[PDB]
């Protein structure tokens, strides 16, 4: 197959994500023959692990998924290491030598990718030095992969963006959003624009409400430290949920390129309504988990590292509105929570009921197109049909599909995908600045009301599907959740 | 449940259909509590089997599906018999006594149904005498159930209709069409008008071609006598196929009553194009089966009772055209044959491919909604989605549904249904004169070309899906059969 000529620099190349997913993903791209010879990987961090120590380190990350050891060694020989502090301007001149050397060794003409697997605060600095100290490639491309998260509010994200803008244009930036790399999420566009019946039905005339759900049965566990300040609202909503909602609410693009897709999504984001205090209390719900039945399921306030007066939200549910002609009056419901009934990520599109009367006992109900992302991809379609009774009557049936074993084994892990797209230079599966800015602006208005404590904090027995308020939020518009454990 | 007060007269009450399906169906309506007391069944034929002999006869038909024998006896006691020749005008006065007596015995105020399970030629006579000799009920209703077939051409069907019109209005007539009583066929309307996405897509803008298939793996066997003169063209096409095509091509009714449904179907039938000689040769295909591989599968011309110079068609395939705005240019393909690959009755709706380009290797294909009627009800929906590859690419997947065991056991057998609808007076599931007249007119133009031998007779190896000409007929419009064994 075609060879990818690139040189990748991993800032924080000895960390968890690095040796647990980054390195393995890069190995798969080698196994599939995409990376052959003209490529090199330059690890970097503070430790002065020498060139022999690094190789062993990588051999352990790509350990479990290798069988021909000779294949492993030949790959590992494309790695090099250099000790380096990201704040020290001169240290960069040392890195530049490691990079300019690896390039020469494998005749790599430019094409550099800088992966930042470091603390959020260092993002601005590294960007600044890459350009000033001359680590940027004179030929080919220069791309930056920014790890999560991108800011903690609109103000901070704006700062980050402005710093990055000094050296890179927005299209050269690749913010890593885990969920946007999931196979099933990339099917939403295929189903919609690939089948005219849905394509033409994707609007206010045929849909009654769209629902998005991010479920987790696990509690906070040892993640309490950071989680207590972020909560579901920033952990799952602001990033993952909004970017999935983006694929759903987007306009129909003039073409299927990153440029046009982004233009199509931004049209919806720019129509997203921002809430004031009253609206936040009417359209959103925040809750926190109590006890289940089992002592195994302890209340949030009894978890380790959790303050006994914490108002952190472990569950969020709300109604989004898009002031666009195609979405006039169509509610978009989202929900994310911990200690819920099950682990699952899915989209449920509820179509409007038909007005055609059969004179039957049970008249036509609402059809539903469910796209299941996690744990395993599935697509269900609930339709109206005839019941098996003597008198004519309707019922609903579910047509179903599921990913095959062959499909599941060939499915490219999210990181492998994101890394591969970046080498190709395809922002189709990445959130753009415009998208992120609006998402922050939207979430900030909610957080303002929470930090000020101007909304109640609901509670819910662990293992449930959330507080009653979740149901009442939908009941208000004559709606209800399709999924319920 | 509500009780059905009726008195049914079975002309030919000792025949096959009578004791093999008619009687059992009537027993089920008793088991389900619909028929309780104010009802009676008057058998009739030429044999003078006395009132005790008849009861035993019925006890054998409802034999295998009875367990509480006391339930059986109480039912059987509502039957009476009378010897009677249908040509003898005075014999009717004898029948009138059997009927007027049974009515008195169970206080049945009118509501009479006359089932004609006699030879086609007797239909006109019985109708005539029922009215003149006064067997018709003065109160309630008087309905006639006409068994298959209704005419053998337009001329003969017109004769029959005119004779029947002398005593009954068209709405009081109930022509028995086996296939129109099948559960799955009655689902076609539920799926279409019950789900706006299909409802709005049911036209020339979204569908590329509709396909209907009636398959049989069995040969002619001992049915050769009659079959050699009728063939597939009249055996399966004229009746079964056209009436299913009626449900598919129908307009959207102003309501869901028999009157409006029929008005909706007739709009399509009245737009059906009738072919001349050239068109018959371009749009239709007739074939006859040869040998398979196994001696078990003998050529048609070697079957018992088959003339060694017979040009009888054992397979028919053709393109129907509806000159209606909603069907402008949408081909309707039908096919019926013996000794084909499998036994199956199904409808395949092929939607047009999308014009949206993904720049992918495989661009969007045609979606397909398959409704499987026989052997067991199923609904499949082929849609475009994303393939599990590194580069973005589309593929097709099938969402599936199947009838459950509970559904299959509760499914009311076609005859039970037809008989039940007639007692209710619902022509929704029956073909009306207008529908039949056009079907005959359509088929006659084809037969004229066949009897004149102005079209070739194709051949096909038994077990196949038909002659190559079947494929070429669809290839011409850039189409192909969805099902293929
Ligand atoms: N918490 C979340 O929501 C979340 C979830 C998933 C992924 N992530 C990301 O996972 C990544 C975690 O990183 P990790 O697992 O690779 O490891 P890590 O935290 O252990 O440290 C990674 C590297 O940083 C280097 N380092 C530390 N300080 C340095 C400095 N002052 N100068 C130079 N190098 C320095 C260390 O030497 C090490 O090699 C982060 O980028 C985080 O954003 C975040
Ligand atoms: N061939 C097909 O395509 C087809 C398929 C399915 C059903 N059918 C129908 O099945 C039915 C078959 O009838 P059957 O199975 O009940 O039995 P059958 O042919 O044995 O005879 C039925 C009754 O007709 C009576 N009979 C005959 N001549 C009579 C006369 N001159 N006067 C009065 N009574 C007379 C006999 O006594 C008997 O009781 C037919 O109505 C046929 O149309 C046709």
UniProtKB/Swiss-Prot annotation, chains A, B:
Its recorded name reads Glucose-6-phosphate 1-dehydrogenase
Q: What species was this sequence derived from?
A: Leuconostoc mesenteroides
Query: Active site located where?
Result: 240 (proton acceptor)
Q: What class of enzyme is it?
A: oxidoreductase
| Phenotype for residue 21 to E | Almost loss of activity
Binding-site list for NADP(+)? 12-19, 46, 85-86, 148
According to the UniProt record, activity depends on pH as follows: Optimum pH is 5.4-8.9.
Family to which the UniProt record says this protein belongs: Belongs to the glucose-6-phosphate dehydrogenase family.
Phenotypic consequence of residue 21 to R: Decreases catalytic efficiency toward glucose 6-phosphate
Q: Which residues are recorded as binding substrate?
A: 178, 182, 216, 235, 338, 343
Effect noted on mutating residue 343 to Q/R: Strongly decreases catalytic efficiency toward glucose 6-phosphate
Biological process annotations from GO: glucose metabolic process; pentose-phosphate shunt, oxidative branch
What is the protein's known function? Catalyzes the oxidation of glucose 6-phosphate to 6-phosphogluconolactone. Can utilize either NADP(+) or NAD(+).
The outcome of changing residue 177 to N is: Strongly decreases catalytic efficiency toward glucose 6-phosphate
One Pfam family, please name it.
Answer: G6PD_C
Q: Which domain of life is it from?
A: Bacteria
Per the UniProt record, which EC number(s) apply here?
A: 1.1.1.363
Changing residue 14 to A: what effect?
Answer: Decreases catalytic efficiency toward glucose 6-phosphate
Q: Which reaction does it catalyse?
A: D-glucose 6-phosphate + NAD(+) = 6-phospho-D-glucono-1,5-lactone + NADH + H(+); D-glucose 6-phosphate + NADP(+) = 6-phospho-D-glucono-1,5-lactone + NADPH + H(+)
